[PDB]
């Protein structure tokens, strides 16, 4: 990157998750997709960007 734009990062924005999180997020998506589970009508409408902001996985 080599970017000089550096400011305060709070604490919940400086969490980078291990590479294994791709497995577990795929597992959550698979368990929700099959077995017929749907989110709340109202969490689905966080398509206007208010939904959970989930931490980045490394690599």
């Amino acid at each position: 990157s080599l970017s000089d734009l550096r400011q305060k990062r709070r604490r919940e924005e400086c969490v980078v998750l291990p590479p294994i999180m791709t497995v577990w997020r795929s597992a959550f998506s698979q368990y929700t997709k099959m077995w017929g589970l749907t989110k709340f009508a109202g969490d689905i409408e966080a398509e206007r960007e208010g939904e959970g902001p989930i931490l980045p996985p490394i690599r």
């Binding site: 990157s1 000089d4 550096r6 604490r11 400086c14 969490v15 998750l17 291990p18």
Partner: protein, 175 residues
């Protein structure tokens, strides 16, 4: 059982360069140190902790595997604030044995901890001894680990980029 098929004897690939300077040993520390390590070593080193990570979070994950006689969080000598290295002392050596196997590689605070064996915790090594009172690892690191402050003190110092939410341990006498 598997503790009879794998040699889980306490070991330290690490050598405190300051306890080797003393005793004047040419890497002879292992010959003498191993004793206090195999028997009576209940101290486990904690590594890769965010300056944000707090002792209660450390206490809970360790408490699961054993009761903690002493919980110590490393303090930068200059700031008396966490260096991201922690020392945990257990009443039971088996609890220390439990901690190294169970907690190695676990996320104590959304980060990969590295639990090791230590011969014992005195009140000297509890202070980071690198450049800016932190750990030597911090100066020589060439990466962006924001939870450890950002770039290493030596790469940050020259490039030119640089707290309050950190816990100031003012109940610990200054070194």
């Amino acid at each position: 059982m598997a503790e009879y098929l794998i040699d889980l004897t306490p070991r330290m690939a690490y050598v405190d360069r300051h306890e080797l300077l003393r005793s004047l040993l040419t890497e002879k520390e292992f010959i003498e140190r191993r004793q206090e390590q195999l028997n009576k070593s209940t101290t486990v080193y904690v590594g890769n902790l965010s300056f944000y990570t707090t002792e209660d979070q450390i206490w809970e994950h360790f408490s699961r595997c054993g009761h903690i006689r002493d919980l110590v969080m490393g303090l930068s000598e200059v700031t008396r604030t966490p260096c991201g290295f922690c020392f945990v002392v257990f009443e039971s050596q088996d609890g220390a044995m439990s901690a190294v196997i169970d907690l190695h590689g676990t996320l104590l605070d959304d980060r990969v901890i590295t639990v090791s064996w230590d011969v014992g915790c005195d009140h000297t090594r509890r202070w980071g001894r690198g450049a800016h009172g932190g750990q030597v690892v911090d100066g020589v690191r060439q990466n962006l680990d924001s939870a450890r402050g950002g770039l290493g003190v030596l790469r940050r110092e020259e490039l030119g980029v640089g707290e309050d939410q950190l816990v100031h341990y003012t109940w610990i006498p200054p070194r």
